[PDB]
Amino acid sequence: GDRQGSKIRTNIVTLQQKDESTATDMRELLKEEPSIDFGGGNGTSQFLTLRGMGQNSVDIKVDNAYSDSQILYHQGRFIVDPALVKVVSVQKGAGSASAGIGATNGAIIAKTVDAQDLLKGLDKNWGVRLNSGFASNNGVSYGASVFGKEGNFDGLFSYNRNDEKDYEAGKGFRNVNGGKTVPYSALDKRSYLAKIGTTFGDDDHRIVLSHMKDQHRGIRTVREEFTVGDKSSRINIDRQAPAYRETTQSNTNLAYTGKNLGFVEKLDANAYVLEKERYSADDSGTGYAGNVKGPNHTRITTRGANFNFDSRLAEQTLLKYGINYRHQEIKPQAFLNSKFSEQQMKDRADEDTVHAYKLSNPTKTDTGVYIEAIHDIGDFTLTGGLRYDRFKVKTHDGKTVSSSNLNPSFGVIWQPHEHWSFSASHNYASRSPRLYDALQTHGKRGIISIADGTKAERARNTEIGFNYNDGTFAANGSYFWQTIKDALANPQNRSVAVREAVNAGYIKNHGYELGASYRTGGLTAKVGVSHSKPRFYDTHKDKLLSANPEFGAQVGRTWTASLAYRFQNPNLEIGWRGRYVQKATGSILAAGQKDRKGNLENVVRKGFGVNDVFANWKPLGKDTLNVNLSVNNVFNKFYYPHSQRWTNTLPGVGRDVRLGVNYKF
Amino acid sequence: DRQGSKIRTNIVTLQQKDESTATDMRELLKEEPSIDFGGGNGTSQFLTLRGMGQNSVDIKVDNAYSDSQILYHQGRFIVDPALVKVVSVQKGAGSASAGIGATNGAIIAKTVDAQDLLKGLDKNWGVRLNSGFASNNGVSYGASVFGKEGNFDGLFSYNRNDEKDYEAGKGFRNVNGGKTVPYSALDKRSYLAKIGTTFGDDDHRIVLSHMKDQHRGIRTVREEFTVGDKSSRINIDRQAPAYRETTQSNTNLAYTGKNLGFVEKLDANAYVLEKERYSADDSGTGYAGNVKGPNHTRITTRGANFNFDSRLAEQTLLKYGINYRHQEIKPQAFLNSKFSIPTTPMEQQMKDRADEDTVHAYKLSNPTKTDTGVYIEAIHDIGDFTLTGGLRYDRFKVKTHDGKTVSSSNLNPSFGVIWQPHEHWSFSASHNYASRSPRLYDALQTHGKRGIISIADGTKAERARNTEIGFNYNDGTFAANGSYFWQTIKDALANPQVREAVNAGYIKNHGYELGASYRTGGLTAKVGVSHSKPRFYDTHKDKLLSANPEFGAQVGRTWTASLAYRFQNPNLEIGWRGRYVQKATGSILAAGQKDRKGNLENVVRKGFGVNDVFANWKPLGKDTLNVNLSVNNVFNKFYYPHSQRWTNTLPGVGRDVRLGVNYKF
Amino acid sequence: DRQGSKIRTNIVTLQQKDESTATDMRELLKEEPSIDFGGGNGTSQFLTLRGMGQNSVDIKVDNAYSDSQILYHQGRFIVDPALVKVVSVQKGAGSASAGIGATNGAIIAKTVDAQDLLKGLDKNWGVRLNSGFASNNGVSYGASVFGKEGNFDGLFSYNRNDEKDYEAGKGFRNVNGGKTVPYSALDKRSYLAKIGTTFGDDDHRIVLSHMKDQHRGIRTVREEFTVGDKSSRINIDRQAPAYRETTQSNTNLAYTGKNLGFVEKLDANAYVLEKERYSADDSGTGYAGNVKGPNHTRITTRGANFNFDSRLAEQTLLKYGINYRHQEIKPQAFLNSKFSIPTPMEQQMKDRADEDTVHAYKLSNPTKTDTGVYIEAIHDIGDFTLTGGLRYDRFKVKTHDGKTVSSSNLNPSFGVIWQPHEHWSFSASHNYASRSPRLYDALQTHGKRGIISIADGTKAERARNTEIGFNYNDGTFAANGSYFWQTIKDALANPQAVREAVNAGYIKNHGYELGASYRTGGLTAKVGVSHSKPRFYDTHKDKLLSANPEFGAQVGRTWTASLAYRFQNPNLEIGWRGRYVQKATGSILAAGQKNLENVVRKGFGVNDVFANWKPLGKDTLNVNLSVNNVFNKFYYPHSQRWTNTLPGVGRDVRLGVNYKF
Ligand SMILES: CCCCCCCCOCCOCCOCCOCCOCCO
Ligand SMILES: CCCCCCCCOCCOCCOCCOCCOCCO
Known part of the structure; x- marks a missing residue:
């Protein structure tokens, strides 16, 4: 099973569990997880943090494809729709060698659903699945899915829609x-x-071809992290200029897995193309897009491939090795550049420079080779590995800067008794600079480059853990320490017309997580708690590190608990679930954060509890029909979640009563 | 049905509707002489019952209904008959169990169910496909899947009707x-x-339902008019056509329990009904505040109804229950601050300047209206008389967009007698009181850019006093019915008095309806005639009632007739139908209506007659396959209907040849 | 088919199309040397046949076709092959039964039917799903449901192809x-x-049908160009991209009765064809009158055809029938009143009198009515088949000023096929046909730029097409050849404040096509080449004929070939396909196009490789892999303007799957 205490949580959500839930986003789906925290608002209003660390350092992987770029820093990076997914897992902090590219702070990891998952409940080779959803506060949802198998072939098509109103x-x-x-x-x-x-060749070979699309549309504000405030605020209707918008994530993915190949005992490979889009019907009131009148369209394309081989050197020792490749390219609709605007000469001088550039699409290439040995001796499991990672960054001025890193990793698990494991790991990982905001790439606000020696961030993550499970009672615990060198955030002047990405500081993180469960005769009881302390230490004279929620937030210590009971007759689970986040204090920046004026901010944020009760009934006895009812935020709590800015941005959803139905035939 | 012609239950049956070629209520209910629809497609249409408009007459689907409107230049939304299984009608003031607002009657529809679709089939699931062509000018299709497993049942239906500009x-x-x-x-x-x-000996049923009904296309500001000459008020610029979606949605939870002891039957309903207007650009829409780019306007209607039947004795039933409805209008944004009165002269701009300040100073909230009623009704059979007595207590509360709140309440008695002396004869009389609360202003004008719309201090509900008599003859071959009615309605409200909703006068209506039918060996012959005379008497110094079609129309005496013959081999019915409306003369306003420049309009409306031939064949003898051919308006008559403005707004559909197939397997 | 290469029936089969990865006509018909398509997506594309453009060549689906256009900066709409079950081609002037306007030929398509989809299945209903992936750069999918109960049948297909900017x-x-x-x-x-x-001993059939084909996206004013440098005439401001939908719809009622006695066969069709352009904002569209906000422009085409075959004797068939078509263009609004000539004085005064006249016109929707009656006798004697026919064609044009002008024509046709041996045919035909003036551009009909009328005597174009051909086929080897000569009198192009459609010259064309194939046990080899020479000759003093690609282009000599092997196990065909077009020279204008242009168009080759696999052996599952333009060749095709408009798609790797159950 999972034996690194709480640092790797495999299959947090299973499809069969997800079908008993009423949630229609990751935020509500993973709320029992204390180290994970989502800001408020719908869609890309949301920021995610893991152990206090933002999507600058934590990735969402679906079918093992992931970008690290962003559209605009006033919104979070795109969070996949759980309607697509069959499993969600989590890996926290710096991963081991097989973890892939950029594993400094961890990842939400999801797999899309398959034919065999949907056929599960049925006694035949094809099937249909319908669902509908109703939410009082305030939405309506439905979907359908058709799937099947003939000879050595299988396929599915799923369409899902969730039409959500302004939430109360x-x-x-x-x-x-x-x-x-x-x-x-x-x-x-x-x-x-x-x-x-x-699936062919004794069931030891499989090729899958996959296309996914996830899209959000509506009238949205420039800056999705805020709504519209009073006309006297910076967040008034004019500055926030709502306009129709679509934001999309698409992935075409080719995947292969072979087992028992003689030359290797398992191989996994993946080649994909991931597209991230922003479309706006009118960008006149959008400063960041260069106030581009009429429709505007911004793309980020990510091409990747991964190969992964497992070779068995002996009954007790596995050797994993492989290679990762990713190329990312950002495409503005048009470069804007030529339009960039008593001793101002210095400024006319500046003006003439920007105009003089001829800009190209920025790219970034990451690649890594890795090996890992996993050795079992006595009731120890030892893991040794190494990655070598390089990147290359070509910014929009054509400037190219690369670097590379050698990243070791060590891990021990000890399992002395059959109900017990204990764990320790010491993992290094690196993470290449991110490209600037896709929506700002047109260069109307000046040129954005990269300094000559700039290098990747590099994490040293040490941690310990334990797992207890005896079949009735379970518990797990993790303590971790993180240092990350060469953090990068805002660019340095080389006057503010041309700036360059630079290493500008270091990062500390540390904390703990506990979890326990109790299972008997239909009763399922659960508690968990997590606290961590992300800190950003400025090292550069112009203090360029950032409290943008993308980087992290100092989240209150978070408690979660659940209580549920499953009746033998009728087949019905009712239960309660709560999440309590305590009062939090302090910026992620050790020197503190300022305020558009430049003034110290006394970052404080309130605690709050959210409570939910839910029910799942299975009127037919099988998992072919699920009728689900939930009332979320029972007490209609008014609150702001912690992973977002601390000024009063976007509150949690008030109370919400939801009825969902899925049905399979 | 024994109130002569005042309650017509099941005017349209599903099995009849499957033999027809109509795709809207207007064509479906054309044999009904007291009902009249204005010209044009979708919400261009106004409906009148006994000459009374959608201000006083509601369409109820699954016992959910709003009384609000989007804009007075269009009619209120008329459900798609593709959704429905039955249509019924109740004319004039209803009895106590009729629901909220029953002063002038209602079209009442129920949506289709699983058991209705399974009708023709000898199994527990099925599919239904349909297709339609119309020469003038459209194409339609739909599909439906439905079934039953254990105690469960469900259906999904999609229907589409893509209609071109009509000739x-x-x-x-x-x-x-x-x-x-x-x-x-x-x-x-x-x-x-x-x-x-359906559970518990078949004496219990819970149904959960979602319906959506949506029209889209390039539509004019003001759908009651097209585009006229560039010299008219209805030219391309003023009428500024643009893409639009207008939508009616309902999520409905319905319960019925039977044989629960003291309560012989219980019916209950709780629902949320959404009405929407979406426009892709509202720059040329004055009424929306010339809002540039996309614009959404919402009306949300939450309701619940509970209805109990208790049996006090074998001949007496007691009905009692409670109705609740909350309506809330939501503009996309209040506009208030941009209130502006042009100079254009005149030299009394003074007070203008003042009024401009008055208006910019308000803070506006979504208007709401809450209606609630408790009622009791006894139905007593003695000898060959059936007596009905009832009472309703109704209250409302109106919160306009300035936050002002005004309520009132009413106690509304109702008495009804049916006498059935012979088995082929009934005679009837009723004396029914009902009330109807003020309507909220137009949803699309709620933004307040043209000024503040409030409600005066003592304003109260309209109150109807409807007396009527009738008879029903039926001997199995020959049938007939007749109704005469008289209607007084006190405290009529129309245009406001910052302006406020006030009571401004009273309404009269009287008239009649005769019908008769003749059915014997294959032939079926029908006729119908109806004439009413709605009159609106101003009481206020500013003359404030309105000749808007919403309120009503003086419609010509209307005759309908049909003749059809069902052959036995093939199973084929061929028939003629005709509708003839005589010339009508006045305004609905007793003192006369005035034309923009304030002059009295000499209201005159031509008579016309429309003839239709149709055929229904059943190639297999069962009802599981209908092939329907029709030609409507055979003589390609050019005319204007009467329920709309009298100037020449939207003409009837020319001649139209139609083919429709439905098939169920 | 026995007219050498002039009539190619069933060039594309549904069964073939299911093994292909193509999602447009351009890629689907690329092995066809006489057909050439401009660069770009959707209506950026022009078509030419024997060097003749969409001004003279039609696309007929289910025997319904318009000859009108939206705007001359884009081509006429080309149907989506996802709808079709067959594509066929008829070149040059047709015989008498060919329909209206058959001066230069037509691509001919039939929409798919229930029986075609049921093909691989052993039951009365079925579903078909498909998906597509294209690297450069798109994604596609669709679904179809279909069946049959008693004497009846039906289908619904939806298809979608979401294509990005191409590399x-x-x-x-x-x-x-x-x-x-x-x-x-x-x-x-x-x-x-x-x-x-289908009823009455399977000798009668009525079909009702509605089709819609629609393209949306951000498109430029003038789809034949992209956006160039800000110093060019094709810069972002002039080209003002904006959201656009362009749509073709057809509702069609079709009847076929057979062996009805005297009448051996009857085919009839009555249809309504809609062509539509919708734009979200036309402010930067000069041609639409700079109409602010949404704008939509329509062309409606109502037609009917009746066709009888009567057998006068075992060897002689008589065909006769009648063709009717009405076309009406509807602007959103006439704009007429705002005509304005920019500000010498002696011309100014003329100018200001001009706008007064324009402003006095009250304008109506332009219409055009075409009708024709025809007879054809087909007579078989010895190993000769002789065809004699006649059409009488009239039109009536009502332009937007209410002016009405008609003419009529009597068009004879003669055809001989001689089949001496069972592997051999030879052919010749001498066909006359006429083609009525086209209405001005739909999108310009508002008349803001001035009034567009028709001169008093103007008449139809009239084609005299003569041609010879041969067909060899012995079961293993096949070849065909065609030579043709075309003269077309009274060509019309650009108008003569108030301007007038006029006959302004003539057109000549000649050239050849040759094909050859070789089929032996799984292996299939094919080659072809085509060369033609369209030439427009001004007759009018103000040189009025046009070099726009609508009328044609001097395409380079074009070669195509392919080589494919179909393995028995697995059921897999792999192959290669090439299309090389030689360098070209010259205008279609005989006197040259203008400041005189020296027209040169570079040659190029395109190579593709493809595989079709049937993992189940039935035709119910096709997995398609192709790589088109393997060597990533940069080029401009010739059926467009010679300047450098819109290039060939670069290299593109595609996988498509269809499955039937
Ligand atoms: C608009 C984007 C969203 C739609 C996603 C689909 C786009 C196309 O993707 C291609 C990927 O292939 C999926 C294959 O599905 C087609 C084959 O149907 C299944 C038949 O196989 C079952 C064999 O028993
Ligand atoms: C200018 C006039 C000529 C126009 C002709 C165009 C006609 C358009 O045809 C297609 C649309 O048809 C829709 C109406 O459907 C009529 C159905 O009649 C068919 C009878 O079939 C009997 C079944 O046994």
Whole structure:
């Protein structure tokens, strides 16, 4: 099983569990997980943090494809729709050698659903699955899926839609027209999956071809992390200029797995193309896009491939080795550059420089080779590995800078008794600079480059853990220490017309997680707690590190608990679930954060509890029909989650009563 | 049905509807002489019952209904008959169990169910496909899947009707000199999703339902008009056509329990009904505040109804229950601050300048209206008399967009007698009181850019006093019915008095309806005639009632007739149908209506007659396959219907040849 | 087929199309040397046949076709092959039964039917799913449901093809220095709805059918160009991209009765064809009158055809029938009143009197009515088949000023086929046909730029097409050849404040086509070449004929070939396909196009490799892999303007799957 205490949590959500839930986003789906925290709002209003660390350092992997770029820092990076997914797992902090590219701070890892998963409940080779959803606060959802198998072939198509209105925050929230809803938080969210696959050669070989699309549309504000405030605020209707928007994530993926190949005992490979888009119907009121009148379209394309081989050197020792490749390219619609604008000469001088550049699409190439030995001796499992990682960054001025890193990793698990493991690991990993914001790449605000020696961030993550499980009771614990050198955030002047990415500091993180469960005769009891302390230490004279929630947030210590009971007759689980986040204090920046004026901020944030009760009934006895009812945020709590800025941005959803149905025939 | 012609239950049956070629209520209910629809597609249409408009008459689907509107230049939304299984009608003030607002009657529809679709089939699941062509000018299709497992049942239906600009009858010429009515094309879609359980000896049922009904296309600001000459008020610039979606959605939870002791039967309903207007650009829409780019306007209607039947004795039933409805209108944004009165002269701009300040100073909230009623009704059979007594207590509460709140309440008695002396005869009389609360202002004007719309301090509900008599003859071959009615309605409200909603006068209506039918060996013959005379008497100094079609129309005496013959081999029915409306004369306003420049309008409306031939064949003898052929408006008559404005707005559909197949397996 | 190469029936089969990865006609018909398509996506494309453009060549689906256009800066709409079950081609002037306007030929397509989809299945209903992936750069999918109960049948197909800006071949650079062609992305959707009945000993059939084909995306004013440098006439401002939908719809009622006695066969068709352009904002569109906000422009085409075959004797068939078509263009609004000539004085005064006249016109939707009656006798004697025919064609044009002008024509046709041996045919035909004036551009009909009328005597174009051919086929080897000569009198192009459609010259064309094939046990080899020479000759003093690609292009001599092997086990065909077009020279204008242009168009080759696999052996599952333009060749095709408009798609790797159950 999982034996690194709490640092690798495999299959946190299973498809069969997910079908008993009423959630239609990751935020509600992973709320029992204390180290994970989502900001408020719909879609890409949301930021995610893991052990306090943001999506600058934590990735969401679906079918083993992931970008590390972003569209705009006033919104978070795209979070996949769980309707597509069959499993979610998590890996925290710096990973081992087989972990892939950029594993400094960890990842949400998801696999899309397959034909065999959907056929599960049925006694035949094809099937249909319908679902619908109703939410009082305030949405409607449905989907369908058709799937099957003939000879050595299988396939599926799933369409899902979730049409969500402006959500009502908890009690006491008032929106400036004096309503209870959060302006421009409506989103029409659609996804599809198309898969075809073949399994051949004694079932030891499989090729799967997959296309996924995940899309959000609606009238959204420039800056999705805020709504519209009072006309006297910086977040008023004019500055925030809502306009129709679509933001999309698409992935075509080819995947192969072979087993018992003689020359190797298992091989996994993946080649994909991931597209991230922003489309806006009018960008006149969008400063960041260069105020581009009418439709505007921004792309990020990610091409990747991974190969992974497992070779057995002896009954007790496995050798994993492989290679990762990823290329990312950002495409503005048009470069804007030529439009960039008593001793101002120095400025006309600057003006003439920007105009003089001829800009190209920025790219970034990451590649890595790795080996890992996993050796079992006595009731110890020892893991040794190494990665060699290089990147190359070509910014929009054509400037190219690369570097490379050698990253060792060591891990021990000890399992003395059959109910016990204990763990320790010491993992190094590196993470290449990120390209600037895709939406700002047109270069209208000046040129964004990279300094000559700039290098990758490099993490040294040490941690210990234990797992207990005796079949009734379970528990796990993790303590971790993280240092990351050469952190990069905002660019340095070389006057503010031309700037360069630079290493600018270091990062500390440390903390703990506990979890326990109790299982008997239909009763399922659970508790968990997590606290961590991300800190960003400026090292550069112009202090360029950032408290942008993308990097992290100092989240309150977080408790979660659940209590559920499953009746033998009728087949019905009812239960309660709560999440309590304590009061939090302090910026992620050790020197503190400022305020557009430049003034110290006394970052404080309130604790709050959210409580939910739910029910799953299975009127037919099988998992072919699920009727689910939930009432989330029972007490209609008014609150702001912690992973976002601390000023009063976007509250949690007020109370919400949901009825979902899925049905398989 | 024994109130002569005042309650017509099941005017349209599903099995009849499958033999028809109609795709809207207007064509479906054309044999009904008291019902009249204005010209044009979708919400261009106004409906009148006994000459009374959608201000006083509601369409109820699954016992959910709003009384609000989007904009007075269009009619209120008329459900797609593709969704429905039955249509019924109740005219004038209803009895106590009728629900909220029953002063003038209602079209009442129920959506289709699993058991209705399984009708023709000898199994527990099925599919239904349909297809339609219309020469003038459209194409339609749909599919439906439905079934039953254990105590469960469900269905999904999709229907689409893609209609082009229609050609009017002969001699119509459109201003480019074409024969089609500009911007009358609509792409009309509907869905139904339902899931239900029947349990407990078949005496209990819970059904959960979602319906969506949507029209899209390039439509004019003001759908009651097309585009006229560039010299008219209805020219291309003023009418500024643009893409639009207008939508009716309902999620509905319905419960019925039977044989529960003291309660012989219980019916209950809780629902959320959404009405929406979406426009892709509202720059040329004055009424929306000339809002540039996309614009959404919402009306949300939450309701619940509970209804109990208790049996006090074998001949007496007691009905009692409670109705609750909350309506809330949501503009996309209040506009308030941009209130502006042009100079254009005149030299009394003074007070203007003042009013401009008045208006910018408000803070506006979404208007709401809450209606609630408790009622009791006894139905007593003695000798060959059936007596009905009832009472309703109704209250409302109106919160306008300035936050002002005004309520009132009413106690509404109702008495009804049916006498059935012979088995072929009934005679009837009723004396029914009912009330109807003020309507909220137009949803699309709620933003307040044209000024503040409030409600005066003592304003109260309209109150109807409807007396009527009737008879029903039926001997198995020959049938007939007749109704005479008289209607007084006190405290009529129309245009506001910052302006406020006030009571401004009273309404009269009287008239009659006769019908008769003749059925014997294959032949079926029918006739019907109806005439009413709605009159609106001003009481206020500013004359404040309105000749808007919403309120009503003086419609010509209307005759309908049909003759059809069902052959036995093939199973084929061929028939003629005709509808003839005589010339009508006045305004609905007793003192006369005035034309923009304030002059009295000499309201005159031509008579016309429309003839239709149709055929229904059943190639297999069962009802599981219908092939329907029709030609409507055979003589390609050019005319204007009466329920709309009298100037020449939107003509009837010219001649139209239609083919429709439905098939169920 | 026995007219050498002039009539190619069933060039594309449904069964073949299912093994292909192509999602447009251009890639589907690339092995056809006489057909050439311009560069770009959707209506950026021009078609030529024997060097003749869409001004004279039609696309007929289910025997319905318009001859009107939206705007001359884009080509006429080309149907999506996802709808079709067959494509066929008829070149030059047709015989009498060919329909209206058959001066220069037509691509001919039939939409798919229930029986075609049921093909591989052993039951009365079925589903078909498909998906596509394209590296450069798109994704596609669709679904179809279909069946049969008693005497009746029906189908619904939906198809969608979401295409990104395409990357051109190597060395192309776009002005932001990318490799993609700006605004060449299109979201392309089609659906088909059909219901039919077959009755009366299977000798009678009625089919009702509705089809819609639609392209949407951000597109430029003038789709034949992208966006060039800000110093060019094709810069971002002039080209003002904006959201656009362009749509072809057809509702069709079709009847066929057989062996009805005297009448051996009857085919009839009555249909309504809609062509539509919708734009979200036309402010930067000069041609639409700079109409602010949404704008939509329509062309409606109502037609009917009736065709009878009567057998006068075992050896002689008589065909006769009648063709009717009405076309009406509808602007959103006439604009007429705002005509304005920019500000010498002596011309100014003329100018200001001009706008007064324009402003006095009250304008109506232009219409055109075409009708024709025909008879053809087909007579078989010895090993000769002789064909004699006659058409009488009239038209009536009502332009936007209400002016009406008609003419009529009597068009004879003669054809001989001689089949001396069973492996041999030889052919000749001498066919006259006429083609009525086309209405001005739909999108310009508003008349803001002035009034567009028709001169008093103007008449139809009239083609005299003579040609010879041969067909060899012995079961293993096959070859065909065609030579043709075309003269067309009274060509019309550009108008003579108030301007007038006129006859302004003539057109000549000649050339050849040759094909050859070789088929032996799984192996299939094919080659072809085609060369033609369209030439427009001004007759009018103001030189009025046009070099726009609508009318044609001097394409380079074109070679195609392919080589494929089909293995028995697995059921896999792999092959190669080439299309090389030689360098070209010259205008279609005999006197040259203008400031005189020396027209030169470079040659190029395109190579593709492809595989089709049937993992189940039935035709119910096809897995398709192709790589088109393997060597990533950078080029401009010839059926477009010679300047450097829109290049060939670069290299593109595709996988497509269809499955039937
Ligand atoms: C618009 C983007 C969203 C749609 C996603 C689909 C796009 C196309 O993707 C291609 C990937 O292939 C999926 C294969 O599905 C087609 C084959 O159907 C299944 C037949 O195989 C079952 C064999 O028993
Ligand atoms: C200018 C006039 C000529 C126009 C002709 C165009 C006609 C358009 O045809 C297609 C649309 O048809 C829709 C109406 O459907 C009529 C159905 O009649 C068919 C009878 O079939 C009997 C079944 O046994």
